[PDB]
Design a protein around this ligand. Structure first.
Ligand code: FMN
Length: 147
C-alpha cells in the first residue's frame, strides 16, 4: 500500500500528528510519503497513492481559517486527482473555539464533493496531540482497516 500524508501546521501540532500517523503506517508496511503542504504542488498530487491523508489545523477564532500553508492546496484540491481516491482527514484545534477543527470539516466536504471516498471519520484533536497520542495510533489502525 502507498500512502501520502500532507499536513499544514503552524506550531507543529498537526505536523507531530502527521509524523505519528506516518510512523504507524510505515511500521505496518505501507510506503509512506509525508509532506508539508508548503512544499507541494496540487497538480496530480494524489496520483499513484492508494490512500491520502490530509492534515490541517484550524485558525481564525471568529471564523474558520485553514492553516496558512494549507490554503493554496485546499484552493486547488480539484487538481489533485481526488475522485475515487481513498482519503481521510485529521487536524488539531481547541474545542473552546466556536468552530472546533473546522478545517477538518471543510477539507472533508470538499473531498466528498470531488468524489473522494472518505474511509474514516476525521481525526479531530482537541489540545496537544502528544496528550492524544493513543487516539492517533488508534485512528491510524482504523484507517488501515477501512481501505
Ligand atoms: C489565536 C488562535 C486561534 C485559533 N482558532 C481556532 C479555531 O477557530 N478553531 C480551533 O479548533 N482551534 C483553533 N485554534 C487552536 C489551534 O488549532 C491549535 O493551537 C492547534 O494545536 C494548532 O495546530 P498546528 O500547530 O498544527 O498549527 C486557535 C489557536 C489560536 C492561538
Amino acid at each position: 500500500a502507498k500512502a501520502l500524508i500532507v499536513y499544514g501546521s503552524t506550531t507543529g501540532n498537526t505536523e507531530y500528528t502527521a509524523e505519528t500517523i506516518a510512523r504507524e503506517l510505515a511500521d505496518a508496511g505501507y510506503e509512506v510519503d509525508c509532506r508539508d503542504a508548503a512544499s507541494v504542488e496540487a497538480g496530480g498530487l494524489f496520483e499513484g497513492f492508494d490512500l491520502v491523508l490530509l492534515g490541517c489545523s484550524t485558525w481564525g477564532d471568529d471564523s474558520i481559517e485553514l492553516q496558512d500553508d494549507f490554503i493554496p492546496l485546499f484552493d486547488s484540491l480539484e487538481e489533485t486527482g481526488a475522485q475515487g481516491r481513498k482519503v481521510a482527514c485529521f487536524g488539531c484545534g481547541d474545542s473552546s473555539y466556536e468552530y472546533f477543527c473546522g478545517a477538518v470539516d471543510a477539507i472533508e466536504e470538499k473531498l466528498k464533493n470531488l468524489g473522494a471516498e472518505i474511509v474514516q471519520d476525521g481525526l479531530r484533536i482537541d489540545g496537544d496531540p502528544r496528550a492524544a497520542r493513543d487516539d492517533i495510533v488508534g485512528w491510524a489502525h482504523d484507517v488501515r482497516g477501512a481501505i
